């Protein structure tokens, strides 16, 4: 029936004709090469260097499972041509995610801002929600750092993802998001760190 | 041969239906199993396949730049959706009774045969005159006042999504 063969390529498991008339091969390659990026993602986003890179890596798996959820759900056994047409409006989007990642890659703020410029570049198209849901969770830990100088004042650093690192007492070196609030955060914290010693 | 053709009309060429970079899809030569009179209707049928291939090749290539070109291709797949869906159906009808000939298959396309041709030169004017910027929202509109009802109902969809970009930017500025 061959449908359980083609449908089991989007998952990654090899098959009798998927290793690792006669024109079907051309049709097969159009759904085949879709699979080669799905596997090329789990090889790239499997780990749980940078903290913000982990969250973006943790946000990606929040999406692939949906792609694994949509498959193996609707079709028990459908027509061969139905598969190619059904997975077109969705398959091409999977190949777009290869242009985003590698399959080098920035980290820290350099990545949290690079992903932002990917929004305005392709805003109105159908790639707005998926990129947004990534950016909405790829900035989750970075807000916590920002949520320190505003509430508690205990600066938290791990590898340098923060744009700011650590008589005169004012040597916390400082030097996208609106600069109208950038420089203000730098002073909104040092005041708290100064009242803690008084 | 039926399922062979329904792939050739999808964008996959083979031995029976060779592909040429200049002319387009066409039958190679006479075949003994089939009749020598069908060698014509297929060539009349491929004049449609060549359109879809040259469509999807351009759609993927994205080529020139600008959002209004990105969105045009984004919408260009929507009008092209009933073509695919109506092609998946042909296989189902042939799966039921095995007495259907190419005549019925040629008959099923009907609407797509008189639509693609008029929506082919709209693409050609873009790639041949470097239509950059919002000027697309007129070049597509000047062809939206066409007489053919099917076309008048196709381009209007593309203009209906291409306006979504301006409506996005316009509200973002005002």
């Amino acid at each position: 029936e061959l449908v359980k063969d083609v449908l089991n390529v989007l998952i990654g498991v090899v098959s009798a004709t998927f290793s690792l008339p006669e024109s079907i091969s051309s049709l097969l390659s159009e759904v085949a090469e879709y699979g080669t990026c799905y596997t090329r993602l789990s090889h790239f986003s499997l780990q749980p260097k940078g903290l913000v890179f982990q969250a973006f890596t943790s946000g990606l798996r929040r999406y692939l499972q949906y792609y694994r959820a949509c498959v193996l759900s609707t079709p028990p056994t459908l027509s061969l041509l139905t598969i190619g047409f059904l997975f077109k409006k969705l398959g091409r989007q999977l190949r777009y995610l290869a242009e985003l990642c590698g399959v080098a890659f920035p980290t820290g703020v350099k990545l949290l801002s690079y992903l932002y410029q990917e929004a305005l570049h392709n805003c109105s198209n159908e790639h707005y929600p998926v990129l947004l849901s990534l950016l909405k969770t790829s900035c989750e830990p970075y807000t916590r750092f920002i949520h320190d100088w505003v509430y508690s004042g205990v600066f938290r650093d791990a590898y340098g993802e923060f744009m700011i690192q650590v008589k005169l007492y004012w040597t916390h070196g400082y030097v996208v998001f609106l600069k109208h609030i950038a420089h203000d955060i730098y002073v909104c914290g040092k005041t708290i760190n100064l009242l803690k010693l008084c | 041969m039926i399922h062979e053709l329904l792939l050739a009309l999808s964008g996959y060429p083979g031995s029976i239906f060779t592909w040429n970079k200049r002319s387009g899809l066409q039958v190679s030569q006479d075949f003994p199993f089939l009749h020598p009179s069908e060698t014509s209707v297929l060539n009349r049928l491929c004049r449609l396949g060549t359109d879809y291939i040259r469509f999807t090749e351009f759609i993927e290539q994205y080529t020139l730049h600008g959002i209004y070109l990105r969105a045009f291709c984004t919408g260009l797949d929507s009008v092209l959706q009933p073509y695919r869906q109506a092609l998946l159906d042909l296989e189902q009808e042939f799966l039921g009774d095995p007495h259907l000939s190419i005549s019925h298959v040629n008959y099923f396309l009907d609407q797509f045969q008189l639509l693609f041709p008029s929506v082919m030169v709209v693409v050609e004017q873009i790639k041949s005159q470097k239509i950059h910027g919002c000027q697309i929202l007129e070049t597509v509109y000047k062809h939206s006042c066409g007489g053919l009802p099917p076309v008048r109902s196709a381009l209007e969809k593309i203009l209906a999504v291409c306006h979504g970009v301006m409506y996005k930017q316009l509200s973002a500025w005002m």
């Binding site: 932002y116 929004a119 305005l120 805003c123 807000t143 505003v150 509430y151 998001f177 609106l178 609030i181 203000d184 909104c188 005041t191 708290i192 | 996005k168 509200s171 973002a172």
Partner: peptide, 19 residues
């Protein structure tokens, strides 16, 4: 539209009170 209001709104309300 990219209007960053979910960040600055719970933020500017606290900056003026500290200063």
């Amino acid at each position: 539209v990219l209007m960053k209001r979910s960040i600055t709104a719970p933020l500017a309300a606290h900056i003026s009170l500290v200063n």
